[PDB]
Write a protein that binds this ligand. Structure first.
Ligand SMILES: CCCCCCCCCCCCCCCCCC(=O)OC[C@H](CO[C@@H]1O[C@H](CO[C@H]2O[C@H](CO)[C@H](O)[C@H](O)[C@H]2O)[C@H](O)[C@H](O)[C@H]1O)OC(=O)CCCCCCCCCCCCCCCCC
Ligand SMILES: CCCCCCCCCCCCCCCCCC(=O)OC[C@H](CO[C@@H]1O[C@H](CO[C@H]2O[C@H](CO)[C@H](O)[C@H](O)[C@H]2O)[C@H](O)[C@H](O)[C@H]1O)OC(=O)CCCCCCCCCCCCCCCCC
Ligand SMILES: CCCCCCCCCCCCCCCC(=O)OC[C@H](CO[C@@H]1O[C@H](CS(=O)(=O)O)[C@@H](O)[C@H](O)[C@H]1O)OC(=O)CCCCCCCCCCCCCCC
Ligand code: SF4
Ligand code: SF4
Ligand code: SF4
Lengths: 110, 361, 206, 393, 193, 55, 147
């Protein structure tokens, strides 16, 4: 069975997406940043997120594969995404979708 | 009038190979029956939703149309536009075929629904027996919807559905058997023309058996086991999303208007405003070629068929909210332990009464 | 750092349509869809009961066409009623993603829009479902009067009637997916059958 | 694309998404051909941490929180939450407040039994009674909404020294009207139902606990009184204004789903007796009469006395509960509630623990599913009246 | 041995038939009664006299003692005071309540000393954006809805405001009162003999 | 009818008939009366005609 | 008349501020918003009961104070003007930005007059306010309907 940490704009699984399926593997740790397109992404920001994901899964892991640790990785990835959005590297989508600012409203940095 | 005569004659007046005109007319009734079947489905959905609401001191759909008339239209058009899903390891071709095999033979059995004489598609010689044979293909559809799923939830529902649809096919045949004993035949028009002055009054047990067996075709809340939400989530339907699920949602109400019309024609008769109407020689009408009297009696026959079909649709969707469900084993004991013995007893009784008193049988 | 949490400021402006025929057909596409919403029979806690009161005879959502559905495959609306703990968050996302695409969400009660009375000193409640799924309408209040759930349904119908068939592009999922090998010692699942047939249930240890 | 049948015990997951009113419970159950070998109930999908919150909130800050443990009746747990510091402080509750509290608790018991009764009859029959209880359960909602602010739970009508406020004006008469309109229907239920032989054979002998095993398994609720134990915390503890009303504590003897149903119906019927007996005897009668007497002579007369007030002395939100632990209890709808308050010296308690009745009645789910059938699982689930809000602690 | 079993089978079958016929008659009777449905959008149900709706805030009466923040179950009301230095008077700069986090228990309204805070009958709060539920000090007064003064709603009393014996509130005259007499009326009657 | 005054309600078709309260705010012709009673001070809006400035 | 042309958009461009009278079932005015959006106008609905002065929220800045709940002592955010910030973020070929207000009944005549006057200034900015009412979706200029 799968082991996953699924929240908004982060989806970590424990398998390999071959064509759309998941296929639990016990060492792949796929990642699916922002499926619903709450935000608008760039090529540099996605690379930063992938690098953070790698250094978070590789440099700090010798522990079990419980769903607790998967959630613990997803939480750090989402804090990193929120920091990227605060600094302004990315932004909300503004498209005609739901548009509920889940990571905070736009403020003016006083 | 004989609209077929006029159509073929006016079409042959401009040539067009008279024998070919008879081929150019089949679509006309073959789609008139489709129209009345679709309107019957809309009526059945509307009646269910508006009668279940009256029974429960409530109000059904009222913000769709004037009286929720457009509620079935909306519920169908939604399911048209819905994204269809096909789960991971499920089969790709038995999936999209189950809901069609459970529907095609339910429509095909409308060949034999009379709606008044000369007002039906090709009164067949096998008639009701052809319907008994065609109503045995839906279990293949349910087994197909269950076998082509990676969900063991729904295979167990497909099995318990295909095992209920075969439990109520022997008594459903033993009731039509006793009706065909009296009817001298199997064609629906020949079955009903024995009512010339009703079979319910001479088959008071076969009527009960037929009606219970027809309600127990995985249709009504008396049973509705594969649809019994609480015990199991939708059974086999739990994985169909768009139009594939609307085919189940639709093939279960057409399979109810069909049974209502069939109880009407077998035990009551799609003719015969109760007095022996065709003995209206008291108005000195030459029915034979009366240009009207024909249309007046046509309308009377259609109304008298629809009254007694609506009676049973009403009573079925009323029992839905009156009779408690049975698990699955109290269900499989109705057939094979109560309905099959009583069906055999009714058949033997009709045989004994037909051999002794050949009059009135 | 000029404006924190900025907006997209996009390009390629709209590519929307104008002819009377296609917008008149869009009218029907959106009327059939909003007047036959089928909610998923999904309750977790207190608010569900008020939702059930909204099903009952006192005022039923049967009018304006709402029929509660059991499986998410036929459901196109999930009224999240109840507090979502961290134990059950993935059990909701699943039910949301396992459900056809023209779908909607209503977050009812305070416990699904901000966390509610559990937004403080609670270590297991998800502080709002807006951080799990794209909510469409929020109605506040510990258990909201079931004629406030219907007000939320009104505000959701007038949002559904806004959609545009020439705009269903903002409805798929982009799937920016990656991959990274790990070394993390898979453990055996500690949740199986074996409750009464367990050997430790039949006799006390010496 | 298939499931590859094989001769083993099959494990099925009736997981958290219950399309019913039985909270979120997982119930991994294995079965050998329409039986039950053993089930492992997986509770916890609604643990929000009430016990750790209660240690950081003062009493009046925590009293809205309590209406959630066991949703329904959201006044039993309010009653026990009020009683916990009240006993330590020894604060005397007046008699009028005790009568209002009794009336509210009895209306809540009726509502609890109605909420249990609806889905129970649904799982063993048709879905129409679900539309009838909620026609009959609303007449109590609309009485609560007059007395207290809201409908069922989130009333926070109770207070330490009594009750937040007196009833409305035309309240006693209207409660009488409801009682007279409702008492025939608790029997109309057993008329339209409870006599279908198919329906009574359905829960004839399914689910069973011996009297000596219900005591061992600690089944405080009507699950005990259905196993032949005449024991409820209203008559053994002498709850506040009892022995002032007639008492028929209903008990069966067999200990099956049918016994549970019968005890619950007789208890719902006795609650109307309790209400009608208390209403005719409030210390002051209807509130408009009491207010009229108080504005006519109660400037100094006895109608302005301590025994006729809805509350004692109004306490500050800094009540500072005293030192010393003790265990309080109330016979709720599902049985015994228990709060093992401790408290050290300040507003925040020390280890406010909640002892819910459903958490202990649910312990014998596996024992009650010792090979009964696969179909009577939902009936045994409904016979216990599971509320996951009281399975969070 | 075998006749008792058959007579029991008959006494069970005929009983099961009668107990279905009775339910059928009961259900067919149920569809004559007037539906109790309160057709919400055009038949809104008028709330009680103690219904706890949206909080109302009178900026002028607030003295910024923060008891609303202190008796709140979740310390919700944001009070931003500055403590002007005229002699000792605190000054209020911004009062707010995130109604998305609100619990509607009205402890704040119970302990406001200056009657600055009150409850209303606005249960019709719903937005597309929860960040619009944070009410300013000005968006809170706003003169509540008053369902009765709506040209497209026929208000319907609930069970506690219907005359004696009346159960439903649909077919009601235009002169009904709650249940009995008020205290002033009873005292006035007692005044004259 | 000005704010701060104590008023009563004179409209037999209202649930707040013969109630007494204090005017908190008046805008656009309609008033807002606060009934301090029970436990939680209620505030409901009346027309300028459904009141009476009780002495 | 069961199907509408584009008179709504013409009337909005003429008056500037309309006042809808949608039926209280809320599924028959979204098509008019779709008509607005198909012309080039971009909408944004923000549920009027919940805005502040309507001048600090729409034109000027305003310090939003989130819900601290015992932790995180009072902090302000200063979200930008809800209009001047959305007029800058319009799509390239955008005809304007109309402001939709769902529950307009809660506002007062003063705020209605303000919203009407705000349309003349601040050019690319129209206003629709769903004041509740009639059983058909009828509109009327917002400068009217008051005084
Ligand atoms: C969604 C569900 C509802 C949707 C409606 C269906 C869509 C169609 C909409 C069109 C409706 C307009 C048609 C007007 C109806 C009059 C036509 C008619 O009666 O025509 C009848 C003719 C008659 O046919 C001839 O009828 C003759 C005599 O009648 C016979 O008919 C029966 C056979 O014996 C009787 O037993 C009778 O005694 C017998 O004499 C002979 O049988 C001939 O062989 C035969 O050809 O058939 C025909 O062309 C009829 C063929 C067309 C079928 C359409 C009928 C629709 C039902 C309308 C009923 C109206 C009721 C009253 C309306 C006012 C309200 C009070
Ligand atoms: C170049 C491209 C070409 C492409 C072709 C595609 C284009 C399509 C062309 C236009 C579409 C028109 C579709 C319908 C037109 C109506 C045709 C018709 O009128 O067709 C008439 C048909 C045919 O039967 C009639 O049959 C009699 C003639 O006898 C012969 O008619 C039949 C055919 O032989 C039988 O075999 C019969 O035994 C045979 O003897 C009649 O007198 C007429 O002549 C004859 O036409 O009517 C019947 O079949 C009876 C079935 C209708 C009965 C109606 C009962 C109506 C139900 C009530 C309505 C309300 C329901 C709502 C509630 C429902 C709840 C349950
Ligand atoms: C085997 C063969 C079987 C094949 C199957 C058959 C498939 C049939 C598919 C078609 C079904 C469509 C039904 C539509 C019913 C309906 O709309 O509901 C009626 C509702 C009711 O509200 C109305 O609205 C009005 C109020 S208001 O102004 O809208 O607010 C007022 O009239 C009142 O509310 C009410 O009347 O109308 C609406 O609410 C607005 C929706 C607008 C509908 C568009 C008009 C239809 C045009 C068709 C497309 C033609 C294209 C050319 C036009 C230039
Ligand atoms: S939203 Fe309120 S009523 Fe609903 S479960 Fe949460 S606390 Fe209870
Ligand atoms: S409204 Fe009351 S509790 Fe709130 S700050 Fe003002 S005086 Fe204090
Ligand atoms: S309603 Fe409850 S949460 Fe809101 S301010 Fe009042 S006490 Fe605090």
């Amino acid at each position: 069975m799968l082991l996953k940490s699924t929240t908004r704009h982060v989806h970590i699984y424990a398998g390999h997406v071959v064509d759309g399926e998941v296929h639990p593997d016990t060492e792949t740790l796929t990642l699916n940043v922002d499926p619903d397109n709450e935000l608008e992404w760039n090529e540099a920001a996605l690379a930063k997120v992938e690098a953070k994901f790698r250094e978070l899964v590789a440099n700090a892991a010798g522990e079990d594969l419980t769903e607790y640790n998967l959630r613990r990785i997803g939480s750090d990835l989402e804090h990193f995404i929120r920091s990227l959005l605060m600094q302004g590297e990315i932004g909300y989508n503004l498209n005609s979708r739901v548009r509920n600012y889940s990571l905070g409203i736009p403020r003016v940095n006083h | 009038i004989d609209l077929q005569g006029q159509f073929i004659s006016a079409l042959q007046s401009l040539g067009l190979s008279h024998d070919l005109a008879k081929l150019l007319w089949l679509p006309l009734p073959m789609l008139m029956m489709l129209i009345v079947a679709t309107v019957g489905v809309l009526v059945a959905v509307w009646l269910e939703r508006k009668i279940s609401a009256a029974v429960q001191q409530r109000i059904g759909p009222e913000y769709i149309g004037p009286l929720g008339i457009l509620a079935p239209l909306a519920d169908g058009l939604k399911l048209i536009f819905k994204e269809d899903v096909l789960p991971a390891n499920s089969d790709r071709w038995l999936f999209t075929l189950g809901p069609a095999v459970v529907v095609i033979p339910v429509f095909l059995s409308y060949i034999i629904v009379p709606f008044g004489q000369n007002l039906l598609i090709s009164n067949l010689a096998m008639g009701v027996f052809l319907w008994i044979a065609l109503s045995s293909i839906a279990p293949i559809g349910l087994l197909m919807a269950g076998y082509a799923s990676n969900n063991k939830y729904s295979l167990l529902g497909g099995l318990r559905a295909a095992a209920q649809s075969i439990s109520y096919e022997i008594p459903l045949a033993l009731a039509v058997l006793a009706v065909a004993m009296m009817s001298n035949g199997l064609g629906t028009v020949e079955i009903v023309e024995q009512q010339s002055q009703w079979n319910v009054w001479r088959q008071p047990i076969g009527f009960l058996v037929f009606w219970i067996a027809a309600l127990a075709e995985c249709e009504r809340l008396p049973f509705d086991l594969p649809e019994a939400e609480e015990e199991l989530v939708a059974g086999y339907q739990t994985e169909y999303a768009g139009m594939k699920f609307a085919l189940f949602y639709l093939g279960a109400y057409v399979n109810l208007v069909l049974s209502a019309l069939l109880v009407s024609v077998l035990y009551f008769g799609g003719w015969s405003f109760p007095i022996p109407l065709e003995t209206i020689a008291n108005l000195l009408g030459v029915s034979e070629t009366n240009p009207f009297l024909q249309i007046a009696f046509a309308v009377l026959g259609i109304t008298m068929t629809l009254i007694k079909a609506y009676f049973f649709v009403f009573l079925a969707i009323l029992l839905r909210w009156t009779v408690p469900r049975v698990r699955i084993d109290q269900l499989l004991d109705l057939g094979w332990k109560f309905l099959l013995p009583v069906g055999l007893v009714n058949l033997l009784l009709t045989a004994g009464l037909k051999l002794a008193f050949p009059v009135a049988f | 750092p000029a404006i924190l949490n900025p907006i997209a400021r996009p390009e390629v402006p709209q590519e929307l349509a104008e002819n009377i025929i296609l917008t008149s057909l869009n009218d029907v596409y959106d009327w059939a869809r909003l007047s036959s919403l089928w909610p998923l029979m999904y309750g977790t806690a207190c608010c569900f009961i008020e939702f059930a009161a909204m099903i009952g005879s006192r005022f039923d959502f049967d009018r304006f066409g709402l029929v509660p559905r059991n499986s998410p495959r036929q459901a196109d609306l999930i009224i999240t009623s109840g507090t979502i703990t961290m134990k059950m968050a993935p059990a909701l996302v699943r039910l949301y993603e396992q459900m056809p695409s023209p779908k909607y969400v209503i977050a009812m009660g305070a416990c699904t829009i901000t966390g509610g009375m559990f937004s403080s000193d609670s270590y297991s409640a998800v502080r709002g479902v807006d951080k799990l799924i794209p909510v469409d309408v929020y109605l506040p209040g510990c258990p909201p009067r079931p004629e406030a759930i219907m007000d939320a349904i009104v505000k959701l119908r007038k949002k559904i009637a806004n959609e545009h068939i020439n705009e269903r592009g903002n409805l798929a999922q982009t799937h920016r997916l990656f991959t990274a090998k790990h070394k993390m010692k898979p453990v055996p699942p500690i949740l199986t059958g074996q409750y009464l047939n367990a050997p430790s249930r039949q006799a006390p240890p010496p | 694309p298939k499931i590859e049948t094989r001769t083993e015990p099959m494990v099925i997951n009736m997981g958290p998404h219950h399309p019913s009113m039985h909270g979120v419970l997982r119930l991994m159950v294995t079965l050998d051909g329409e039986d039950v070998i053993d089930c492992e109930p997986v509770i916890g999908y609604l643990h929000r941490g009430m016990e750790k919150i209660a240690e950081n909130r003062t009493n009046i800050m925590f009293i809205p929180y309590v209406s959630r443990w066991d949703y329904a009746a959201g006044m039993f747990n309010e009653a026990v939450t009020v009683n916990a510091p009240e006993k330590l402080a020894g604060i005397p509750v007046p008699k009028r407040a005790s009568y209002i509290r009794v009336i509210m608790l009895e209306l809540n018991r009726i509502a609890n039994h109605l909420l249990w009764l609806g889905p129970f009859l649904a799982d063993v029959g048709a879905q129409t009674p679900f539309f009838y209880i909620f026609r009959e359960r609303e007449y109590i909602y609309d009485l609560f909404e007059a007395a207290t602010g809201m409908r069922f739970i989130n009333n926070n009508y109770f207070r330490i020294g009594g009750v937040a406020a007196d009833l409305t004006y035309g309240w006693v008469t209207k409660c009488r009207d409801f009682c007279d309109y409702f008492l025939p229907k608790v029997d109309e239920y057993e008329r339209l139902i409870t006599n279908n032989p198919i329906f009574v054979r359905r829960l004839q002998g399914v689910g069973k606990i011996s009297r000596e095993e219900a005591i061992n398994w600690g089944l405080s609720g009507p699950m005990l009184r259905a196993s032949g134990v005449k024991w409820d915390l209203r008559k053994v503890d002498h709850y506040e204004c009892y022995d002032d009303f007639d008492w028929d504590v209903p008990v069966a003897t067999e200990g099956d789903c049918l016994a549970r149903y019968i005890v619950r119906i007789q208890e719902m019927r006795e609650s109307v007796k309790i209400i009608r007996q208390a209403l005719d005897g409030l210390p002051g009668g209807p509130y408009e009469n009491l207010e009229a007497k108080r504005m006519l002579e109660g400037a100094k007369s006895e109608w302005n006395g301590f025994d006729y007030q809805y509350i004692g002395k109004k306490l500050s939100p800094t009540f500072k509960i005293p030192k010393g632990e003790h265990y309080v209890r109330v016979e709720s709808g599902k049985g015994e509630l228990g709060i093992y308050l401790i408290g050290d010296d300040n507003v925040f308690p020390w280890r406010w623990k909640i002892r819910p009745p459903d958490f202990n009645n649910l312990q014998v789910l596996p024992q009650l599913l010792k090979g009964m059938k696969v179909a009577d699982i939902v009936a045994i689930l409904g016979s216990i009246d599971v509320i996951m809000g009281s399975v969070d602690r | 041995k075998f006749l008792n079993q058959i007579t029991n089978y008959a006494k069970e079958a005929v009983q099961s038939a009668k107990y279905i016929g009775q339910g059928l008659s009961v259900t067919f009777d149920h569809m004559r009664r007037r539906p109790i449905t309160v057709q919400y959008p055009y038949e809104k149900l008028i709330p009680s006299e103690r219904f706890r709706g949206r909080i109302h805030f009178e900026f002028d009466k607030c003295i910024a003692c923060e008891v609303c923040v202190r008796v709140c179950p979740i310390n919700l009301p944001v009070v931003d005071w500055v403590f002007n230095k005229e002699l000792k008077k605190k000054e209020l700069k911004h009062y707010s309540i995130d109604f998305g986090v609100c619990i509607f228990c009205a402890n704040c309204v119970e302990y406001c000393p200056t009657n600055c805070l009150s409850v209303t009958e606005e249960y019709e709060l719903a937005t597309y954006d929860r960040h619009e539920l944070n009410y300013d000090s000005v968006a809170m007064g706003r003169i509540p809805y008053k369902v009765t003064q709506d040209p497209m709603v026929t208000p319907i009393r609930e069970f506690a405001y219907l005359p004696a014996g009346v159960m439903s509130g649909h077919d009601l005259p235009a002169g009904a009162q709650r249940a009995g007499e008020r205290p002033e009326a009873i005292a006035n009657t007692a005044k004259s003999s | 009818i000005l704010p701060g005054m104590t008023v009563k309600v004179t409209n037999p078709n209202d649930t707040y008939y013969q109630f007494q309260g204090i005017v908190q705010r008046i805008t656009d012709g309609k008033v807002a009366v606060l009934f301090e009673g029970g436990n939680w001070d209620k505030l409901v809006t009346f027309q300028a005609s459904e009141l009476e400035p009780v002495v | 008349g069961l199907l509408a042309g584009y008179q709504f958009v013409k009337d909005l461009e003429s008056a500037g501020a309309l006042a809808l009278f949608v039926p209280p079932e809320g599924g028959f005015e979204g098509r008019y918003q779709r008509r607005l959006r198909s012309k080039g106008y971009t909408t944004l609905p923000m549920s009027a009961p919940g805005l502040g002065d309507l001048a600090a929220y729409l034109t000027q800045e305003h310090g939003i104070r989130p819900a601290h709940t015992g932790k995180e002592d009072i902090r302000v955010y200063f979200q930008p003007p809800l209009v001047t910030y959305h007029l800058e973020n319009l799509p390239p070929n955008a005809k304007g930005l109309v402001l939709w207000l769902i529950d307009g009944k809660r506002l007062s005549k003063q705020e209605f007059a303000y919203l009407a006057q705000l349309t003349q200034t601040l050019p690319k900015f129209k206003v629709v306010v769903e004041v509740g009412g009639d059983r058909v979706v009828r509109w009327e200029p917002l400068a009217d309907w008051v005084a």
